[PDB]
Write a protein that binds this ligand. Structure first.
Ligand SMILES: *[C@@H]1[C@H](O)[C@@H](O)[C@@H](O)[C@@H](CO)[C@H]1O
Ligand SMILES: *[C@@H]1[C@H](O)[C@@H](O)[C@@H](O)[C@@H](CO)[C@H]1O
Ligand code: NA
Ligand code: NA
Ligand code: NA
Ligand code: NA
Ligand code: NA
Ligand code: NA
Lengths: 540, 537
């Protein structure tokens, strides 16, 4: 009665897919608050997930809850979770909160986190101790592995249709307040030769850590040791059940990071991705956690984490209104998923990170974008993997009260308007055709774009054939034109159809024509999925 | 079922109801709701409030409208309707005094001055305040009070009525004492031996013994004796707890007796009251001061080794709700907001200008923190260690000065406010810091709620374990003493509830929910917090 293929992350042609039930899949995700991982809290999780239209829930499973006393395992939460997820026909990503949760051992059992002699903490260069477990603690590694193995044996036994499609190993590893462990135990490894395997993979000359890496030795050392720790846990679990597994990064600012220890040292930050990929070959991907609000910073993060060797998964993102539009470039980069944080009614907000008020309007900002993708999820996922997709978001953030003042003053207003219109105009090269995406304009005539208030728009395009595209967009205009000069030919829209996929087959609902195609393709907040066919034609 | 009883032991107190400590999460009616037809306008509010006990008058005029012709028809209906709703009652005996006056004494009492005489001023004019030296008045009040207690003895065997208030706000406005010939004959004479013995003073006349306090202390003594005799007579029928409620003088700047209600249990005569009326179980403050400092001072003065704290009347406007927390943290046995019914009356500017669902909800939200643990809290308060705090700045009035202010005076002002909105509690090995009006994430300093509203309750369960619930506040734990090289953490925070006296865990708070203290909004959460120190060397 259970014949479904394991989920798997595939990588080729520099592109990636999360295979679920034997085909590409997109996680249109929701993630709970940090204290929702108990049976009694789930009634405060599912309603939000339904309102959001999410297909996949990310939720912790804590070491402390599965092994409250050493060797006495308790999977009562996982049992209820699996059953309730199945009732609602959603899938799960389990977050293993264990040796590290945001740098710290708070979710390790008391017999772990209160026994430093057995399970040692990072020691600073000055001799003081931080509440961050050292990745050189061999007992810690053994005990985390043992518990993780038991979790994976529970899923092997009790989740044969793979309700759980992926597992996050740890949560935001690293250390705040120091660059590495400086304990005697750590110093002995630091003072010794860099392991051959790393030297070989990075194509460097042999030496000790300080000799090989200079001023980067302390940070690279901590990243290597954490990555090896996480890889060993990962390998042990996959030996039981070979699900995709990943780590999530407490990001450093990519333009102005500050110093390791200010940001979480040793996690998969952009400067140690090479270390993590060398050190942890069994981990499937390294996922950014995004709480930067501004378009330029978010865009840079998506660029850094989308690599031929690294599928893009936005494992955590804020739940305030500005964040919703980042679904569009995430999917346009070939991303496999997107998981806004704090999507439950458990009476907590991490404002000022996320939304100040958690209510139906908060959820609706995400529901409105997920409604663009849900009706085509499998078709999009395949085109993303096997084809050409594009995706953009509105590239100016909302005007501040600062800019609000500097506007009341200003001939200057007119130039500013021109500059904003240009910035709110995006070009995409789709082969024989280009698209121009603009934001915040009427659905008729050609008044320049002025942006949405607040910033919110975006667009998704997939290429179906040389002259045919799937298009859906949000609070935006999409206009097509030839990509190269036509040698005396004219061009037009040949046909725009609005429709849907049913059992993989396109069903046309209506043709957009006349006013609906004279002024580009204009989208509001409501979902429309279009197939657009362009033509060039001779006039003699 | 066992009689309710007020216990006092080890300077602590409990109201025992059904053989265990109980907290009155009270509602009190308006003054004209003591009739069967009005009760339909009382119960819906009580239900919305989540109150467990109703305080309501029973008037001498209604039970004895004609001398010797008793009528308990209201008491019957009340008992039956209270039982239907599974709530308890505190009956307020409105008789010789209600707010200094005899308006609730039967017409055959209050219109017969020669039989039942009034206070006479020094100048010979008469006040509408019955003299405590009227022996007829004492006998008549006592007789009727006895009949009421007989009704409860015969008709309330399960003690729906758990306590009785004897009179309401006794004393006299407009004069310090009775200066009638009858009163002068007693005043111009020896202080009674018993009072001299209990205060350890030298024998003499009132004037000799007490000097410039004589007049006021005389009035307080004679009213206390009156109230004790009524009390004793009633308890001899049915030995319920019985108390008196005080029209407070301002504790910082009282003015003169007569301006405030002279002779009641004001803070300067609590020694007289305790000496003269040993059968009265407690003296309860009636609080209509809105401001934190005065309210706090009142709670301090009335919480004594010899006096259980019962807030027998408090305003029903929004600022008053948060005073439940310090009341319970002092080991108070109850709290009773006034005017909780829909009988088309507001005592604004004392209470709320508007009575509506929002008015009630400000109290419902704090009662919802206590109801789920009421019996457990009550036992901890008596037998153990509890604490409770309220947000210590009132709502900003001040906004003129904040407007005219340098961006140096302002940053100074926000720092001063942050410090004032930070409270420290010494819980033994561990301290708690309580702050008000800040996000649930990071450490931006407190700026207070608007309006002021927050508070916290803590009970100690063990050396390192506390029961915690709070409201629009952050609670953070730290070691109370330097740890000598050890570190510390929260070991475990559990949200849960008591079922059959047993703790049931619903979820564990961790991660974001414990990284930045324990953050509470308007919604109820009951936590068990276990702290640990641990070696790193
Ligand atoms: C991301 C992190 O993974 C998550 O558990 C939570 O701590 C949030 C903040 O609310 C982020 O730090
Ligand atoms: C307190 C008093 O006991 C009560 O009956 C009522 O008169 C109020 C005012 O509305 C307070 O004086
Ligand atoms: Na092209
Ligand atoms: Na449609
Ligand atoms: Na008590
Ligand atoms: Na202490
Ligand atoms: Na101390
Ligand atoms: Na609860």
């Amino acid at each position: 009665h259970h014949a479904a293929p394991l989920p798997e992350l595939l990588s080729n042609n520099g592109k990636h897919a999360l295979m679920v039930d034997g085909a590409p899949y997109i996680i249109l995700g929701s993630q709970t608050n940090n204290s929702s991982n108990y049976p009694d809290a789930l009634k405060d999780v599912w309603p939000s997930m339904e309102k959001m239209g999410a297909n996949t829930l990310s939720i912790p499973v804590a070491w402390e809850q599965i092994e409250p006393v050493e060797g006495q395992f308790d999977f009562s939460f996982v049992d209820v979770l699996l059953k309730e997820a199945r009732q609602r026909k959603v899938r799960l990503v389990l977050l293993w909160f264990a040796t590290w949760k945001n740098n710290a051992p708070h979710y390790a059992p008391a017999w772990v986190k209160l026994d430093n002699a057995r399970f040692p903490r990072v020691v600073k260069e000055d001799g003081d101790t931080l509440n961050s477990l050292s990745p050189l603690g061999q007992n810690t590694l053994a005990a985390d592995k043992k518990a993780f193995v038991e979790l994976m044996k529970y899923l092997a036994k009790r989740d044969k249709d793979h309700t759980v499609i992926m597992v996050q190993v740890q949560n935001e590893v690293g250390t705040y307040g120091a660059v590495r462990d400086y304990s005697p135990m750590a110093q002995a490894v630091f003072n010794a030769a860099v392991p051959d395997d790393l030297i070989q993979k990075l194509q460097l000359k042999p030496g000790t850590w300080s000799q090989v890496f200079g001023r980067d030795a302390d940070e690279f050392f901590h990243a290597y040791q954490i990555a090896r720790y996480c890889d060993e846990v990962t390998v042990a679990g996959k030996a039981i059940k070979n699900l995709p597994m990943y780590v999530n990064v407490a990001l450093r600012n990519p333009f102005n990071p500050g110093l390791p220890g200010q940001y979480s040292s040793g996690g998969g930050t952009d400067n140690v991705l090479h270390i993590w990929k060398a050190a942890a070959p069994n981990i499937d991907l390294i996922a950014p956690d995004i709480y930067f609000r501004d378009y330029k910073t978010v865009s840079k993060v998506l660029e850094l984490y989308t690599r031929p060797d690294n599928a893009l998964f936005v494992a955590e993102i804020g739940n305030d209104q500005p964040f919703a539009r980042y679904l569009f470039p995430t999917l346009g980069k070939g991303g496999i998923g997107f998981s806004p944080f704090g999507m439950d009614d458990t009476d907590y907000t991490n404002y000022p990170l996320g939304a100040k008020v958690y209510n139906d309007e908060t959820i609706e900002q995400f529901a409105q974008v997920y409604r663009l993708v849900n009706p085509m999820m499998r078709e999009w996922a395949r085109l993303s993997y096997q084809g050409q997709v594009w995706g953009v978001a509105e590239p100016l953030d909302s005007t501040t009260e600062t800019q609000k003042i500097w506007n009341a003053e200003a001939e200057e207003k007119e130039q500013h308007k021109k500059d904003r219109a240009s910035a709110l105009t995006q070009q995409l090269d789709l082969g024989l055709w280009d698209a121009e995406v603009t934001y915040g304009r009427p659905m008729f005539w050609v008044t320049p774009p002025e942006g949405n208030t607040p910033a919110a728009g975006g667009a998704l395009i997939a290429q179906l054939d040389d002259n045919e595209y799937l298009v859906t967009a949000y609070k935006a205009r999409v206009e097509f034109k030839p990509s190269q000069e036509l040698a005396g030919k004219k061009f037009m829209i040949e046909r725009v159809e609005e429709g849907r996929f049913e059992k993989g087959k396109w069903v046309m609902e209506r043709v957009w024509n006349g006013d609906q195609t004279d002024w580009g393709l204009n989208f509001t907040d409501r979902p429309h999925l279009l197939r657009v066919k362009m033509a060039s034609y001779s006039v003699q």
